[PDB]
Design a protein around this ligand. Structure first.
Ligand SMILES: Nc1nc2c(ncn2[C@@H]2O[C@H](COP(=O)(O)OP(=O)(O)OP(=O)(O)O)[C@@H](O)[C@H]2O)c(=O)[nH]1
Ligand SMILES: [Mg+2]
Length: 167
């Protein structure tokens, strides 16, 4: 734990939060996936622009005054929606204002369109998502936990920019 960056994943149920966490930390995809009970953790150590960082990534259910303990100390946040279900992207702003009720204004937040491997079912055009990120100063990437496309880039990018702030 040279420096340990706590990151929280948030977003509605079944957007792929847990599988995202699984593919980044252990490189595996839980097909047999159940809704997350409580909060689960997973760490990974990587070196961002030349300084070894430990990420300590928190995960919970999309569904208890545990929110404050959930967000406490988070210096990063992945706002995940499900590219194929427009209702997941719509209440991302509602996750966003909860995430800013319980964190610092300078947290590094990436909006994430997960499941980009389901190309024939995409219900969210990337320019409405890019518009929402522009409007809110969010980073943004499309990802597939199933294919691993952009998962590492999503996390390391967050980690790198966290590093630039506190370095
Ligand atoms: N095709 C495809 N399916 C995915 C992808 N990521 C997740 N899924 C599926 O979507 C379902 C939800 O996965 P989870 O990671 O458990 O969903 P979640 O966001 O963690 O939901 P909660 O933990 O209950 O809040 C699972 O059945 C996955 O198989 C993806 O990238 N591509
Ligand atoms: Mg889960």
């Amino acid at each position: 734990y040279d420096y340990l960056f706590k990151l929280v994943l948030i977003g509605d149920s079944g957007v792929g939060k847990s599988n995202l966490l699984s593919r980044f930390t252990k490189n595996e995809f839980n097909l047999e996936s159940k809704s997350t009970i409580g909060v689960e953790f997973a760490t990974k150590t990587t070196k961002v622009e030349g300084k070894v960082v430990k990420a300590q990534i928190w995960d919970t259910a999309g569904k208890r005054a545990i929110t404050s303990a959930y967000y406490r100390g988070a210096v990063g946040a992945l706002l995940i929606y499900d590219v194929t279900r427009h209702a997941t992207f719509e209440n991302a702003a509602r996750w966003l204002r909860e995430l800013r009720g319980h964190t610092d204004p300078n947290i590094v937040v990436m909006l994430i369109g997960n499941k980009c491997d389901l190309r024939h079912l995409v219900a969210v055009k990337t320019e409405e998502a890019k518009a929402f990120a522009e409007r809110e100063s969010l980073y943004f990437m499309e990802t597939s936990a199933l294919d691993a496309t952009n998962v590492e880039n999503a996390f390391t990018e967050v980690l790198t920019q966290i590093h630039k702030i506190v370095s």
